[PDB]
Design a protein around this ligand. Structure first.
Ligand code: MG
Ligand code: ZN
Ligand code: ZN
Ligand code: ZN
Ligand code: ZN
Lengths: 1131, 51, 404, 67, 46, 115, 206
C-alpha cells in the first residue's frame, strides 16, 4: 500500500509526468483565455447598462447573448472561409474570430403599443484567438492533423497571431484586491496606513483604493483618518461611521472594538472620538464629507447627496454597492480600523508588500477583459450618439449601421500588436511591455516567454526590495531564471508545476456557509465577534463562526472531493487572529502538493499503479486530484502548511523535527522553471551561474520548432546536428528538450593550450567544425508589398530598367525575374536585389523602390512566397538562407554560465590527443572554473564520460542522493579511465606527453545567436543624419560609433587635444558659418558672387568665416529659436 | 559633448598571445573599409602610386 | 589606432595600438592589456578609432600608446600585469624543481625577442645538462633591475629564524642584476601591485623595454605551458576521507553550539551585551559560531590540498580564485545573507514552509552546510539563490548611481 | 536533424549505423551493447549515436511543396 | 516569361501573369511559391 | 567574411619563396630559415634532427603566429661548420630515415599478410 | 525537394569516403591539371538521382552515388556494414545532383582526412616521467604496459629518451590502413625533398 523509498523516485516522477500529460507548460495562458471567452465577455456585455434613448418613442437596446464563431477570414469577394493559423502567419492576417451579439430593441411610445424586435447574431467585433485554446481551429487536433496543417505538434500555443506576428501576453503582477494591508511609511505624516484596493466581483470600474491611516505622533494623541476616494482631504473615521448611520459612539466602537475588556485599543481610538464630537448626526457628517471634497457644493443638500453617492459606490465596492449595505460597509471599515490598531499596538505584524500571497498575476484573460470593457463601453457610446442623432429627427434607425465594429476589432488588434495596453489615443498613459513578440529562437525561449511574469515596478526604480528573491517565490517562480540587466528580479518565470488560478464564483461557497453554521454579518450582534472567527470570502467579511477548526476540516474535505469547492480555491485559516480567508478569484499562483495523513502520504502504491497504465485506463492527473491525494496550495495557504521536502521527512526520527506535516513536495526540483530545468547539477553551481545559463539557454541554437520549413520568420537559426544531452535532468522530458534540443555534446578538455582560450574563450577543433560540428543555417525573411493606395502613385513588382527608373542603384538586377521577384536557389551577395519594385511618378513615370539584401549577408534564396495581404494587393516574402560555420568570435556556452568566444581553431593534428586518438572538440581554460565555482560543469563532464562509455543518459536532476561524485568516479574507473575524469594528453605539435593530466570528457555545449559576423562593423565616410550632419546610428544604417562623453573625458585626461578635436569636430560634422564681426550672429554668405552681408547690422565688409561643428550651428540656431542671442564674437 | 564619428570600427574581441601588448589584431575587412589619407611626396610617390 | 572599451572609466580604457592585420573577423588583443580595459572574451566588443592626420597620429603615438600606459597615475602602480595562464604557469615555472632540457630550452629561447643569442650555462652540468626555469626567466627579465618580493605562500615566521636568505620553500623572490636569483614568481611579483618586477622594469627601464618584457614573459611561458600543461577537474574538488570527517565534525559541533545558544535564549539565560538588543546579541552569537565553523572547515580543506591541486595552483599564483572559493567547493558554502542578515522570515515566522515556526537554527536561516561538490539541498539551493540575487541586484543597481 | 556522417571528434563514419542502431535497440539490446555491436568503442562515437535526435522523421510528417 | 507558381495547399503548377490576383486555379488557395530556379548554383562540399 | 581559404596554409602565393635564409648577426655562424606554408610537422623533425648534430650549437623553431602559415628555424653551428650545411644534412638524414622506415614498413606488411 | 537544404546535402556528400587506394596517386590536383574546371585526370564524376514515389520513406544512401570511375566508389558501396545515409525522402520528394570528387588532404578539410582515429603512445610505463601522476596508483595501465599489478609506473629512467612509439591507425575507408601509413611516409619524404630542392636554390642563389 505504502510507496517505499526505493520506489519513490519512480512514483514521484510518474506523478509529475501525469501532471504534464494533463496540463502542459502553457496551461495558464489557455485557461485564462478560455475563461475570458466563456465567461468574461458575456459578463462584460451583460454588465453594461441598457442604453435608453428617447426624444415620444423610446428604445432600450439590451444586449443579452454572445456568440463567438470559429476563426474565419473574409476575402474581397466576401466568402467566409476557415482560416488556419499558418495562413495567418504567411499572409499577415490576424487570427481572430467574429463576435456576434444578440440585441433586443423594443419600441415603447404610448398606449401600451409595445413590440420587441430581436436582431440575432449582430456582428459586434472581431476577437483575436489564442492558439490551441478551445476556440482555436487547432483545438483537439491530433499530431497527424497538425502536421497536415503545417503546424508543429510540439508547438505549445498560448499566443496570438496579429498581422502575422506572434504576440504573447506577459502576466502582469499587481497587489491583490479587497484585502486590507497595513503598512508603515517611514517618511510620511502617517505612522501607520491600512489600504484596501477594493473592486467589485465582476469588474466594471478601476480599483477604488481606500486608506485608513493614523497620524504620526507630533494634537494630544494619535488621530485616525480615512482617505476616501474622490475626496482630496482626510476625513476622521468617526465622521465616516456617522455618515453611514452610526451616530452613537457605542455603536461605532462596537463595530471597531470587538473585545471591550481591552483598554489599550480603547485609548488608542479615543482621540478620533474626541476629534469628532461637534458632528453627531448622519446628515451633518455627510455634509462634512461633501465639504471636504474637491467639489464643495454651495448648498448642503447636493453636498449630502454627493457624500451619499461616494459612500455608497466608491467606498469599498467589494463589500457591496447597492443600498442598505451600510451595515456591511461599517463592519468592514471597522475591521480596517481594527487592523490598523492591531498594527499600531504591535499585536499584528505589518504586511509584507513582497509576499506573493498578497499579489495576483493578471493573465491573458483578465487583461483582455480590461480591454474589452473599455472597448465595449466606447462602442455603446458611439451607438448612443448615432441613435440619438436619428431619434432626434423622430424616425427609426438601423442598429447595424449604428454598430461600427472597428472599435472592438481595431482596439484589441492594436493593443496586442503594439503592447501599449490601453486606448490608442492614450498612448502615453498606456502601459507598454504587455503583449511582446513571441521569442522563436529556440524551443526553450518560446516556452519561457510563454511562462513569463512581469513586476511593473518600473526599471528606473533602484529599490532592491521588489527585485529580491522573496521566500514566497518557492515553488511558484524559478529562483534562477531572471534577466541580469536592468530588470533583475522584476521579470520572472513560472516554476514548472506552478498554476495560476483562472478564477471562480464564490456563490456555492457562500451558499454552503449559509447552510452550514456560519452567521451572517447583518444578523449578529457585535458582542459575538469577540470569541468568534471571522470569515472572509474574496476579501468580503461575510460572517462569523464558532468552531473554525471543524469548519476548515469540512471545507478541506469538500475541496478534496471536488465537491462545491473547486480545486483552485484557497482556504487559509489564520489561527492567532481568528480570520478564515477563502479566495476564489483569478491570478493566485499556486502549485500541487501531496497531502499527508497522520504521518503518511495519501499517495499509496495503487495510485502509482493506475498512473503507470495512464494510456490504457485513462487514469489521469485529474483522477489523482479528485482522489484527495493531491492539492493545489497557493502562496497564502502555504503559510498555514507544514511541508515535507520528501517522504523521508515523514519517517520517525531519533529526534522528530515536526511530526505533524500536512503536505509533501512532489519533487523539490519543480521549484525551477523551464530554462533552469535544463541545467544539470544546478545545486553544484554558484547561483549567478544558474541565472546566466537560464538567460543563455534562450540564445542557444537548436531547432526552435519542427515546422520551420514553412515559417517566414524575420530571423531564424537552425542547428545542423542538434543532440540531446548525454547528461540530462528528469524535467527536460516535459520541456521537450529531447525532441528539440539546442546544443551538441562536445568532447571538452579543460586545459591551458597555447593561450588562445584565456579569459572566457575556447579553442575549437577545426576538423570537427569541418565535419558539421555546431554548424547552423540562418534564415532571413524579407517582406514587401506593392501598394495601389491611389491613382496618384502605385507600386508594382517588375524587373526595373535603366531607361525608365530614376532611383536605380548601380547594382545589377539580372537575378530578378520578369515578375520582379528573385527565384529560389539563386546565390545573392551583399547589396543585391531580391525584389524589383517600381513606383509610378506624379527615369520617367516610375521610380525604383527595390528591396536589397541587408548588407554583407551572402546567402542563397531559400524560397519565395507570394500571396495577398488583408486589403488584397500583391504581397511577397523571400526567405534567404546563409550557412553559418562556427569561427573565431562566435559565442558558445555550456549549461553552467560558462560562456566564451572561439579564440582559435586548430586542426585535429594540432589539438592534444589521448592515448586512443581522441582530440577535444573544445578546449576551455581552467581559470574559468575556480572563481565561478561551476562544479556542475565538472560533474556533468564526468557523468557524460560515464554515460558515453556505458551507453545511457546521465541523471543530473538537482537534488538526488542516489547520484554523487564518488559513485560517478567509481563507475568511470570500471571503463578503464582515471576515476576523476583525467587523461594523459599528448601535445599535438610535438607529440610529447603533457606533464599535467588533463580533465576531458563529454559536456553539452550550446552555440549562441551572437555570431561575430552579425556584429563586426566599420565605417569610413558613410551616410550622415539629416538633422545634425553626423554619422548614422547602427550597422544596418552603415553608421558610425559614438565617441561619447566618457571618451571625451578620457581623451581630456590623456591631454590629446588634436585627437579630441578630430573625433568631436573633424570626423563627425565639420562645418563653416559666416559671422558678423559686429553682432556675432550668423550672416548671409554668397560664395558664388562673393557677397557677404548681415541683414541685422546692414554691413557687408566685416564678415568672418568660422569653422564650427554642424551640431553647434544647429544648437545656436535652436537657441535663436528661443529668443536667445548666442553671439560668436571673434575678437 | 559626444557624437558619432567616421573612421571607427567595432567587433568582438578575441585573445591572441602572439601579439605584443601594444598591438591590436585587426580583420582585413575592417582595414579594407577604413582608410588613412596619406600625403604624396617624392619620398612615397612610388609606393602610393602602387597602392 | 585608439582602442576603446565601454564603459570608459579611466584613461587606460582608450589606449594606442599598432595595427596587425590578421585573417579572421575579431579584434585580437594581448592578454596583459585586458585588465586595463576590464575586458574578457565572453562576447565583449571593442571600438577602434583611426586618427586621420599625422598630428593626431603623433599625439597618440607619444601620449596614448599602451607601453606609455603601463603605470597608472591613479595609484602609482602598473595597471596591466601578467594574467591567467601566464601567471599560473610562471608560478609553476619558477618553482625550484623545474629543470629544462637542451631542446626545451632552445624551444623557449626561440620565443625571446630580447635574446642576445647566447645560450646560458646550465645550472646543472652533470650527470645531464639541465637549465632551470629561473635561469630562463633571468633571460626574460630586462636590464639589470633589482627587486625583492615574497611569494604568497611565504611563511611570516621565516624572515626571523635562520634560512632567511636561503628559503626552504623557495619564497622570498630576489632578482639581482636582472637575474632571478631565487623565489617563485606570482601575482605579487608580476601583477599590478606596487614595487613588482613589471613596475620596477617600467621605472628603471623604459616603456619599450617593459613592453618587450611583458611580451617575452607571455610567449616563453605559454610555450613552456604547452609542455607543462594546466587543468582543473573533479579530482581538484575532492578531499580525503579524513578531511571530510573533520569538516563534518566541525559542522556538527557548530550546529550543536547554535542549538545551545538557542536553548539559552529560549530559557532567558542570555543577557544582552552593551550596544545591542537581545535579538541582535543572539544573532551576533549565532553568526560568530557559524563564521567560526566556516573558517575552521575552510582551513581543514586548505590544509588537505596537495601540491598538485589545480585550485591551489591558481590561487597560489593569484591567477584566479581565492581560498574562500576552495573552501566553498570542498568544505562548506556557508551562510547566505540577504541585506547583511540571515535569511529573513518571508513566511509567517518561517523562512520556508518546510520549517517549524520560530526556528533560528542554522539550516532554517540559510546556512549551507554542504559544498558545491557535495551539492546543495533544496532549501540551501533556494537560500543560495536568494543570496546570489542580492549580488545581481547590487551589480545592476550600483551602476547608475556610480556613473552619475 | 539527421545522423551525422562522421564522428565530429575522430572522423569515424557513423552515418551508416543509425538504422542498425535502432534495429538493435528494438531487438532488446541495451544502448551500450548496441553501441558495442556496431563497433563504436571510443566514447566520442558512442556520444554520436547515443545523443542523436532523429528530427528528420518529424520533418517528413509534412507534405512536400510539390506533389 | 510564364512565371509558373506552386500552390501552398494543392501543390499545383499553374501559370499566373502580372496584374493578376494571386489565386490557385485548382482550389483557390491564396498562398503561392516560386519554383526552384534553373540557374546553376555550385557548392563546395565543405 | 574574413575566412582565409583552407589551401592558404599549404599553397605558396605567387612570388613568395618557400624558404628564405637570413644571417643572424647577434652571434656568429647562425642563420634564420623562414619557411613559408609549413608548420610544426616539418619544423619539429628538422629541429630534432639538427639537435643530433654535435656541430650544431642551437637548433630551434617557432610558428610566430598560428593564423599565419610560416615557421622560422634558427640554427647555430660551430665555426668550422655552417647552418646551411647543417640544415641540408638534417633534411638528408630525415629523408634517409623515412626511406628506410618506408621499406621496413613494406617488409613488415608483407610479413603480416603472408605470415 | 528534401527537407535538408542544398548546403546540408553538399556538406554531407563531401564527408562520404571514396575508395582512393590506387587512384589517388594517379590523379592530379586541379591546381596542377592543365584542363578546364574538370577532367578525368584530376577529378571523378558522381551522379545521384532519387525520387520517392512509394509510400514508405526512401533512404537516399551512399549506394545511390553512381560514379563514372569504377575504382573510386563510396566505401560502403564497395563489395555487413550498411550504406551511409544521405537523406530520407517522403513520397513526392526528389533529389538529383551531380558531384565531382577531387584530390586533397586533411590540412584543407577534414573530409580529406583518411583516418578514423590515430592512437599514438609512447613510454606506456611512465619511465621518462614526461607525465607526473599525483597518485600513480589511481591510473589504469596502458595496453602496452609491461608491469606487475603491484607496480604503478616504471622506475624513473634518467638516461632515457622516447623510443618505441605505438600506433593504431584506423582507416575511415578510403585508403587501407597500411596504405595510409605508406602514403604518409612518402608524403613526408616528398615534403622534405621539395624543401631540400628549394633550400639548394636559396643556397646557390646566395
Ligand atoms: Mg565581457
Ligand atoms: Zn551683423
Ligand atoms: Zn569518434
Ligand atoms: Zn491550389
Ligand atoms: Zn583536370
Amino acid at each position: 500500500d505504502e510507496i517505499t523509498p526505493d520506489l519513490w523516485q519512480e512514483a514521484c516522477w510518474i506523478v509529475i509526468s501525469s501532471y504534464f500529460d494533463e496540463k502542459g507548460l502553457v496551461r495558464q495562458q489557455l485557461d485564462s483565455f478560455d475563461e475570458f471567452i466563456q465567461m468574461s465577455v458575456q459578463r462584460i456585455v451583460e454588465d453594461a447598462p441598457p442604453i435608453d434613448l428617447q426624444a415620444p418613442p423610446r428604445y432600450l437596446l439590451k444586449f443579452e447573448q454572445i456568440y463567438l464563431s470559429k476563426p474565419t477570414h473574409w476575402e474581397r469577394d466576401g466568402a467566409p472561409s476557415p482560416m488556419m493559423p499558418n495562413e495567418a502567419r504567411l499572409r499577415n492576417l490576424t487570427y481572430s474570430a467574429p463576435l456576434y451579439v444578440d440585441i433586443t430593441k423594443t419600441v415603447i411610445k404610448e398606449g401600451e403599443e409595445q413590440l420587441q424586435t430581436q436582431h440575432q447574431k449582430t456582428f459586434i467585433g472581431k476577437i483575436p484567438i489564442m492558439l490551441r485554446s478551445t476556440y482555436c481551429l487547432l483545438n483537439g487536433l491530433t499530431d497527424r492533423d497538425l502536421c497536415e496543417l503545417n503546424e508543429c505538434p510540439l508547438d505549445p500555443g498560448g499566443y496570438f497571431i496579429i498581422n502575422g506576428s506572434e504576440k504573447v501576453l506577459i502576466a502582469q503582477e499587481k497587489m491583490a484586491t479587497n484585502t486590507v494591508y497595513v503598512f508603515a511609511k517611514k517618511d510620511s505624516k502617517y505612522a501607520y496606513t491600512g489600504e484596501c484596493r477594493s473592486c467589485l466581483e465582476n469588474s466594471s470600474r478601476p480599483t477604488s483604493t481606500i486608506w485608513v491611516s493614523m497620524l504620526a505622533r507630533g494634537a494630544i494623541g494619535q488621530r485616525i483618518v480615512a482617505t476616501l476616494p474622490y475626496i482630496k482631504q482626510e476625513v476622521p473615521i468617526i465622521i465616516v461611521f456617522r455618515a453611514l448611520g452610526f451616530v452613537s459612539d457605542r455603536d461605532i466602537l462596537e463595530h471597531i472594538i470587538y473585545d471591550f475588556e481591552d483598554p489599550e485599543m480603547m485609548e488608542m481610538v479615543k482621540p478620533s472620538l474626541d476629534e469628532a464630537f461637534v458632528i453627531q448626526e448622519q446628515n451633518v457628517a455627510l455634509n462634512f464629507i461633501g465639504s471636504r471634497g474637491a467639489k464643495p457644493g454651495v448648498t448642503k443638500e447636493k453636498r449630502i447627496k454627493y457624500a451619499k453617492e461616494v459612500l455608497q459606490k466608491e467606498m469599498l465596492p467589494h463589500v457591496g454597492v447597492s443600498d442598505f449595505c451600510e451595515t456591511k460597509k461599517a463592519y468592514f471599515l471597522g475591521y480596517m480600523v481594527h487592523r490598523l490598531l492591531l498594527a499600531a499596538l504591535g499585536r499584528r505584524e505589518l504586511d509584507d508588500r513582497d509576499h506573493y500571497g498578497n499579489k495576483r498575476l493578471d493573465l491573458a484573460g483578465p487583461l483582455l477583459a480590461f480591454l474589452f470593457r473599455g472597448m465595449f463601453k466606447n462602442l455603446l457610446k458611439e451607438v448612443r450618439i448615432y441613435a440619438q442623432k436619428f431619434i432626434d429627427r423622430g424616425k427609426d434607425f438601423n442598429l447595424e449601421l449604428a454598430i461600427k465594429t472597428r472599435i472592438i476589432s481595431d482596439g484589441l488588434k492594436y493593443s496586442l500588436a503594439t503592447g501599449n495596453w490601453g486606448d490608442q489615443k492614450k498612448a502615453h498613459q498606456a502601459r507598454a511591455g504587455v503583449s511582446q513578440v513571441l521569442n522563436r529562437l529556440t524551443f526553450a525561449s518560446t516556452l519561457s516567454h510563454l511562462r513569463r511574469l512581469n513586476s511593473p515596478i518600473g526599471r528606473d526604480g533602484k529599490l532592491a526590495k521588489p527585485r529580491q528573491l522573496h521566500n514566497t517565490l518557492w515553488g511558484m517562480v524559478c529562483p534562477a531564471e531572471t534577466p541580469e540587466g536592468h530588470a533583475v528580479g522584476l521579470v520572472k518565470n513560472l516554476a514548472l508545476m506552478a498554476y495560476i488560478s483562472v478564477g471562480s464564483q464564490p456563490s456555492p461557497i457562500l451558499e454552503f456557509l449559509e447552510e452550514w453554521s456560519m452567521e451572517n454579518l447583518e444578523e449578529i450582534s457585535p458582542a459575538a465577534i469577540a470569541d468568534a472567527t471571522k470569515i472572509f470570502v474574496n476579501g468580503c467579511w461575510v460572517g462569523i463562526h464558532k468552531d473554525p477548526e471543524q469548519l476548515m476540516n469540512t471545507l478541506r474535505k469538500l475541496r478534496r472531493q471536488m465537491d462545491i469547492i473547486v480545486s483552485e480555491v484557497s482556504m487559509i485559516r489564520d489561527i492567532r487572529e481568528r480570520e478564515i480567508r477563502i479566495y476564489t478569484d483569478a491570478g493566485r499562483i499556486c502549485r500541487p502538493l501531496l497531502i499527508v495523513e497522520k504521518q503518511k502520504l495519501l499517495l499509496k502504491k495503487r495510485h502509482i499503479d493506475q498512473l503507470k497504465e495512464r494510456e490504457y485506463n485513462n487514469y489521469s492527473w485529474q483522477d489523482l486530484v479528485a482522489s484527495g491525494v493531491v492539492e493545489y496550495i497557493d502562496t497564502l495557504e502555504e503559510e498555514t502548511v507544514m511541508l515535507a521536502m520528501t517522504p523521508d521527512d515523514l519517517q520517525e526520527k531519533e529526534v522528530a523535527y515536526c511530526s505533524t506535516y500536512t503536505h509533501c513536495e512532489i519533487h523539490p526540483s519543480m521549484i525551477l522553471g523551464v530554462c533552469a530545468s535544463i541545467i544539470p547539477f544546478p545545486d553544484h553551481n554558484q547561483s549567478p551561474r544558474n541565472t546566466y545559463q537560464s538567460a543563455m539557454g534562450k540564445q542557444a541554437m537548436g531547432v526552435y520548432i519542427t515546422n520551420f520549413h514553412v515559417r517566414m520568420d524575420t530571423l531564424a537559426h537552425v542547428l545542423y546536428y542538434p543532440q540531446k544531452p548525454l547528461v540530462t535532468t528528469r524535467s527536460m522530458e516535459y520541456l521537450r528538450f529531447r525532441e528539440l534540443p539546442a546544443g551538441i555534446n562536445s568532447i571538452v578538455a579543460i586545459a591551458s593550450y597555447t593561450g588562445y582560450n584565456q579569459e572566457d574563450s575556447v579553442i575549437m577543433n577545426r576538423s570537427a567544425v569541418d565535419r558539421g560540428f555546431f554548424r547552423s543555417v540562418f534564415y532571413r525573411s524579407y517582406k514587401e508589398q506593392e501598394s495601389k493606395k491611389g491613382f496618384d502613385q502605385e507600386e508594382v513588382f517588375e524587373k526595373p530598367t535603366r531607361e525608365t527608373c530614376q532611383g536605380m542603384r548601380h547594382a545589377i538586377y539580372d537575378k530578378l525575374d520578369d515578375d520582379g521577384l528573385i527565384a529560389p536557389g539563386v546565390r545573392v551577395s551583399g547589396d543585391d536585389v531580391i525584389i524589383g519594385k517600381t513606383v509610378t511618378l506624379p527615369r520617367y513615370t516610375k521610380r525604383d523602390c527595390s528591396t536589397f539584401l541587408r548588407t554583407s549577408e551572402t546567402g542563397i534564396v531559400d524560397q519565395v512566397m507570394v500571396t495577398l495581404n488583408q486589403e488584397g494587393y500583391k504581397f511577397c516574402k523571400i526567405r534567404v538562407r546563409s550557412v553559418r560555420i562556427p569561427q573565431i568570435g562566435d559565442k558558445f556556452a555550456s549549461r553552467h554560465g560558462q560562456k566564451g568566444t572561439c579564440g582559435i581553431q586548430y586542426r585535429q593534428e594540432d589539438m592534444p590527443f589521448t592515448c586512443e586518438g581522441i582530440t577535444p572538440d573544445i578546449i576551455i581554460n581552467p581559470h574559468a572554473i575556480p572563481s565561478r565555482m561551476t562544479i556542475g560543469h565538472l560533474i556533468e563532464c564526468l557523468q557524460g564520460k560515464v554515460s558515453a562509455n556505458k551507453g545511457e543518459i546521465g541523471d543530473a536532476t538537482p537534488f538526488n542522493d542516489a547520484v554523487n561524485v564518488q559513485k560517478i568516479s567509481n563507475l568511470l574507473s570500471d571503463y578503464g579511465y582515471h576515476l576523476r575524469g583525467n587523461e594523459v594528453l599528448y601535445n599535438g605539435f610535438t607529440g610529447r606527453k603533457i606533464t599535467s593530466q588533463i580533465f576531458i570528457g563529454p559536456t553539452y555545449y550550446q552555440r549562441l545567436k551572437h555570431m561575430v559576423d552579425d556584429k563586426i562593423h566599420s565605417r569610413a565616410r558613410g551616410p550622415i543624419q539629416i538633422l545634425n550632419r553626423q554619422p548614422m546610428e547602427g550597422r544596418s544604417r552603415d553608421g558610425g560609433l559614438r565617441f561619447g562623453e566618457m571618451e571625451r573625458d578620457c581623451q581630456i585626461a590623456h591631454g590629446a587635444a588634436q585627437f579630441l578635436r578630430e573625433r568631436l569636430f573633424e570626423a563627425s560634422d565639420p562645418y563653416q558659418v559666416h559671422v558678423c564681426n559686429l553682432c556675432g550672429i550668423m550672416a548671409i554668405a554668397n560664395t558664388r558672387t562673393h557677397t557677404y552681408e548681415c541683414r541685422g547690422c546692414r554691413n557687408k565688409t566685416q564678415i568672418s568665416l568660422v569653422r564650427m561643428p554642424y551640431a553647434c550651428k544647429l544648437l545656436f540656431q535652436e537657441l535663436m529659436s528661443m529668443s536667445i542671442a548666442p553671439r560668436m564674437m571673434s575678437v | 559633448m559626444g557624437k558619432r564619428v567616421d573612421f571607427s570600427a567595432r567587433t568582438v574581441i578575441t585573445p591572441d598571445p602572439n601579439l605584443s601588448i601594444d598591438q591590436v589584431g585587426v580583420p582585413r575587412s575592417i582595414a579594407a573599409n577604413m582608410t588613412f589619407a596619406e600625403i604624396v611626396t617624392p619620398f612615397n610617390i612610388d609606393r602610393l602610386q602602387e597602392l | 589606432v585608439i582602442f576603446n572599451r565601454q564603459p570608459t572609466l579611466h584613461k587606460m580604457s582608450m589606449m594606442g595600438h599598432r595595427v596587425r592585420i590578421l585573417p579572421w573577423s575579431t579584434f585580437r588583443l594581448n592578454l596583459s592589456v585586458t585588465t586595463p580595459y576590464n575586458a574578457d572574451f565572453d562576447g565583449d566588443e571593442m571600438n577602434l578609432h583611426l586618427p586621420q592626420s599625422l598630428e593626431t597620429r603623433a599625439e597618440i603615438q607619444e601620449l596614448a600608446m599602451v607601453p606609455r600606459m603601463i603605470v597608472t597615475p591613479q595609484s602609482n602602480r602598473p595597471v596591466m600585469g601578467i594574467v591567467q595562464d601566464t601567471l599560473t604557469a610562471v608560478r609553476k615555472f619558477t618553482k625550484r624543481d623545474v629543470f629544462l632540457e637542451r631542446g626545451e630550452v632552445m624551444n623557449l629561447l626561440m620565443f625571446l625577442s630580447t635574446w642576445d643569442g647566447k645560450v646560458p650555462q646550465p645550472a646543472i652540468l652533470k650527470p645531464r645538462p639541465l637549465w632551470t626555469g629561473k635561469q630562463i626567466f633571468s633571460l626574460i627579465i630586462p636590464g639589470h633591475i633589482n627587486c625583492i618580493r615574497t611569494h604568497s605562500t611565504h611563511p611570516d615566521d621565516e624572515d626571523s629564524g635562520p634560512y632567511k636568505h636561503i628559503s626552504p620553500g623557495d619564497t622570498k623572490v630576489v632578482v639581482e642584476n636582472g637575474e632571478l636569483i631565487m623565489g617563485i614568481l606570482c601575482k605579487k611579483s608580476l601583477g599590478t601591485s606596487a614595487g613588482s618586477l613589471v613596475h620596477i622594469s617600467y621605472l628603471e627601464m623604459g616603456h619599450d623595454i617593459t613592453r618587450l618584457f611583458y611580451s617575452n614573459i607571455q610567449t616563453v611561458i605559454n610555450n613552456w605551458l604547452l609542455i607543462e600543461g594546466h587543468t582543473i577537474g573533479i579530482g581538484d574538488s575532492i578531499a580525503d576521507s579524513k578531511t571530510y570527517q573533520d569538516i563534518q565534525n566541525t559542522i556538527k559541533k557548530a550546529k550543536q553550539d547554535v542549538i545551545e545558544v538557542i536553548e539559552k535564549a529560549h530559557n532567558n539565560e542570555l543577557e544582552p551585551t552593551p550596544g545591542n538588543t537581545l535579538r541582535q546579541t543572539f544573532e551576533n552569537q549565532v553568526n560568530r559560531i557559524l563564521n567560526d565553523a566556516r573558517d575552521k572547515t575552510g582551513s581543514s580543506a586548505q590544509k588537505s590540498l596537495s601540491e598538485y591541486n589545480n585550485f591551489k595552483s591558481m590561487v597560489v599564483s593569484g591567477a584566479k580564485g581565492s581560498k574562500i572559493n576552495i573552501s566553498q567547493v570542498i568544505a562548506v558554502v556557508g551562510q547566505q545573507n540577504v541585506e547583511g542578515k540571515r535569511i529573513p522570515f518571508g513566511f509567517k515566522h518561517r523562512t520556508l514552509p518546510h520549517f517549524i515556526k520560530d526556528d533560528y537554527g542554522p539550516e532554517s536561516r540559510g546556512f549551507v552546510e554542504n559544498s558545491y561538490l557535495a551539492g546543495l539541498t533544496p532549501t540551501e539551493f533556494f537560500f543560495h539563490a536568494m543570496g546570489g540575487r542580492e549580488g545581481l541586484i547590487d551589480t545592476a543597481v550600483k551602476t547608475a548611481e556610480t556613473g552619475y | 536533424m539527421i545522423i551525422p556522417v562522421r564522428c565530429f571528434t575522430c572522423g569515424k563514419i557513423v552515418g551508416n549505423k543509425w538504422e542498425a542502431y535502432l534495429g538493435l535497440l528494438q531487438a532488446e539490446y541495451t544502448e551500450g551493447d548496441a553501441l558495442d555491436a556496431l563497433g563504436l568503442k571510443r566514447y566520442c562515437c558512442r556520444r554520436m549515436l547515443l545523443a542523436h535526435v532523429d528530427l528528420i522523421e518529424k520533418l517528413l510528417n509534412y507534405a512536400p511543396l510539390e506533389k | 516569361q510564364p512565371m509558373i507558381y506552386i500552390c501552398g495547399e494543392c501543390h499545383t503548377e499553374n501559370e499566373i501573369k502580372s496584374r493578376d490576383p494571386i489565386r490557385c486555379r485548382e482550389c483557390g488557395y491564396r498562398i503561392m511559391y516560386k519554383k526552384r530556379t534553373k540557374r546553376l548554383v555550385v557548392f563546395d562540399a565543405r | 567574411m574574413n575566412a582565409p581559404p583552407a589551401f592558404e596554409s599549404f599553397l605558396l602565393f605567387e612570388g613568395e619563396k618557400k624558404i628564405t635564409i637570413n644571417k643572424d648577426t647577434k652571434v656568429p655562424n647562425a642563420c634564420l630559415f623562414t619557411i613559408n606554408k609549413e608548420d610544426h610537422t616539418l619544423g619539429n623533425i628538422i629541429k630534432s634532427q639538427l639537435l643530433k648534430d654535435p656541430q650544431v650549437l642551437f637548433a630551434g623553431y617557432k610558428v610566430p603566429h598560428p593564423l599565419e602559415h610560416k615557421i622560422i628555424i634558427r640554427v647555430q653551428t660551430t665555426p668550422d661548420y655552417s647552418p646551411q650545411e647543417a640544415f641540408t644534412n638534417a633534411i638528408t638524414d630525415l629523408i634517409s630515415e623515412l626511406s628506410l622506415l618506408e621499406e621496413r614498413f613494406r617488409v613488415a606488411i608483407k610479413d603480416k599478410q603472408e605470415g | 525537394s528534401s527537407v535538408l537544404h542544398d548546403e546540408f546535402i553538399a556538406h554531407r556528400l563531401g564527408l562520404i569516403p571514396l575508395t582512393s587506394d590506387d587512384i589517388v596517386d594517379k590523379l592530379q590536383y586541379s591546381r596542377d591539371c592543365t584542363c578546364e574546371e574538370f577532367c578525368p585526370e584530376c577529378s571523378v564524376e558522381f551522379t545521384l538521382d532519387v525520387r520517392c514515389n512509394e509510400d514508405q520513406t526512401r533512404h537516399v544512401t551512399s549506394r545511390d552515388l553512381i560514379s563514372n570511375s569504377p575504382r573510386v566508389i563510396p566505401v560502403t558501396s564497395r563489395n555487413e556494414q550498411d550504406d551511409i545515409l544521405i537523406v530520407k525522402l517522403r513520397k513526392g520528394q526528389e533529389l538529383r545532383l551531380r558531384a565531382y570528387a577531387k584530390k586533397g588532404f586533411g590540412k584543407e578539410h577534414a573530409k580529406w582526412n583518411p583516418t578514423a582515429g590515430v592512437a599514438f603512445e609512447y613510454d606506456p610505463d611512465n619511465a621518462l616521467r614526461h607525465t607526473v601522476y599525483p597518485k600513480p596508483e589511481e591510473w589504469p595501465k596502458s595496453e602496452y604496459s609491461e608491469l606487475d599489478e603491484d607496480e604503478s609506473q616504471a622506475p624513473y629512467d634518467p638516461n632515457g629518451k622516447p623510443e618505441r612509439f605505438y600506433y593504431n591507425v584506423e582507416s575511415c575507408g578510403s585508403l587501407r590502413p597500411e596504405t595510409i601509413v605508406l602514403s604518409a611516409l612518402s608524403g613526408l619524404k616528398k615534403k622534405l625533398s621539395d624543401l631540400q630542392t628549394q633550400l639548394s636554390h636559396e643556397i646557390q642563389s646566395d
